C-alpha cells in the first residue's frame, strides 16, 4: 500500500486508540490482511488414472447410446451450411465430431456452429466427450482411440 | 380540499419554529394570523408568510372564502445542518451546526 510509515499519533496520552501505521488492515484504505498472489491451480493426474478415466466414460457412452460409429465422416466444400444440412439429415444437433485425420473442410464448416465441434483422434479430452448430447466417431477414429487406451 | 404551502431550508432550528407552530394548530386562519402578528419571535415572521402563501394558494387555484379555512395540519421538520468550525482555546476546534427546518402548513375549507 502506498504511503509512509510515520506513526499517525503516539503510544500514549492522546485519548485515541493506539496506532502504528496508516496502512494497518483494520484501517480504511490499505487493508488486505492476506493478499493474493498469482498462483498455479493445476493438479497432477497419474497417467493410469487419466487413461482409466477416459475408458470408463467412453464405455458409458456406448451403454447410453450417445456414441455413434460410422465408416466415413467428411464434408465437401468448407460451408457451414453444407454441414448443417447433413446434421439435420442424421438427426443430430448437439454433437461432438471426432475424425480420423484433422479434416480441414470439416474443421472450417463447424466453427460457427455452436452445438458442433470437430476433433482429430489425437486431440481428444475428457470434458468434450461428456459436454455433448451425442458423439460421432469415424471407423478410423475408433482404431486410433483404441490403440491410445489399449 | 387540503392545500399545502412550505418554507424549506428556513434558517431556524426545528425546535424554535415548533413553539410558534403550536400556537396556531387547529385554528381559524383569520384567528391564526393575529396570534402570529403579535408573537414576538423571528419564527413568527417565517411561518406567517407561509400561512399567507397557503391562503393565496386557496383563493387563486380553487378553494377561496377566507372565512372557511382552518389550520388543519401543521408540522415542522428538520432541514440540513450546515457544517462550520469555531475556534476555542488551546488550538481546539468545535463543530457548529447551523440548523435549518422544513416548515409545512396545511389548510382546508372543510
Amino acid at each position: 500500500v502506498t504511503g509512509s510509515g510515520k506513526k499517525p499519533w503516539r503510544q500514549k496520552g492522546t485519548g485515541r486508540a493506539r496506532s502504528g501505521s496508516i496502512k494497518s488492515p483494520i484501517w480504511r484504505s490499505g487493508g488486505v490482511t492476506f493478499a493474493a498472489r498469482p498462483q498455479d491451480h493445476s493438479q497432477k493426474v497419474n497417467k493410469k488414472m487419466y487413461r482409466g478415466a477416459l475408458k470408463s466414460i467412453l464405455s458409458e457412452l456406448v451403454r447410453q447410446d450417445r456414441l455413434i460409429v460410422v465408416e466415413k465422416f467428411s464434408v465437401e466444400a468448407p460451408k457451414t451450411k453444407l454441414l448443417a444440412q447433413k446434421l439435420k439429415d442424421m438427426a443430430l444437433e448437439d454433437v461432438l465430431i471426432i475424425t480420423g485425420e484433422l479434416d480441414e473442410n470439416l474443421f472450417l464448416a463447424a466453427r460457427n456452429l455452436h452445438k458442433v465441434d470437430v476433433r482429430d483422434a489425437t486431440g481428444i479430452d475428457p470434458v468434450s466427450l461428456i459436454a455433448f448430447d451425442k458423439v460421432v466417431m469415424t471407423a478410423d477414429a475408433v482404431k486410433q482411440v483404441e490403440e491410445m487406451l489399449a | 380540499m387540503e392545500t399545502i404551502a412550505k418554507h424549506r431550508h428556513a434558517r431556524s432550528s426545528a425546535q424554535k419554529v415548533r413553539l410558534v407552530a403550536d400556537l396556531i394548530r387547529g385554528k381559524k386562519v383569520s384567528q391564526a394570523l393575529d396570534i402570529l402578528t403579535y408573537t414576538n419571535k423571528k419564527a413568527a415572521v417565517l411561518v406567517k408568510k407561509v400561512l399567507e402563501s397557503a391562503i393565496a394558494n386557496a383563493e387563486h387555484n380553487d378553494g377561496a372564502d377566507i372565512d372557511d379555512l382552518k389550520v388543519t395540519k401543521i408540522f415542522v421538520d428538520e432541514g440540513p445542518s450546515m457544517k462550520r468550525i469555531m475556534p476555542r482555546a488551546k488550538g481546539r476546534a468545535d463543530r457548529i451546526l447551523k440548523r435549518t427546518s422544513h416548515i409545512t402548513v396545511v389548510v382546508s375549507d372543510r
Binding site: 503516539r10 492522546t14 | 468550525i85 488550538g91
Partner: peptide, 26 residues
C-alpha cells in the same frame, strides 16, 4: 451559487500536555 462548501474542514489536532498534575505521590 449555493456551493455550500466553505469549510476545509481539516479539523485541528491539539498536542500534547498542558497539565501533568499529581499526586499519589510516592
Amino acid at each position: 451559487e449555493q456551493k455550500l462548501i466553505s469549510e476545509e474542514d481539516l479539523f485541528s489536532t491539539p498536542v500534547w500536555i498542558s497539565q501533568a498534575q499529581g499526586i499519589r505521590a510516592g
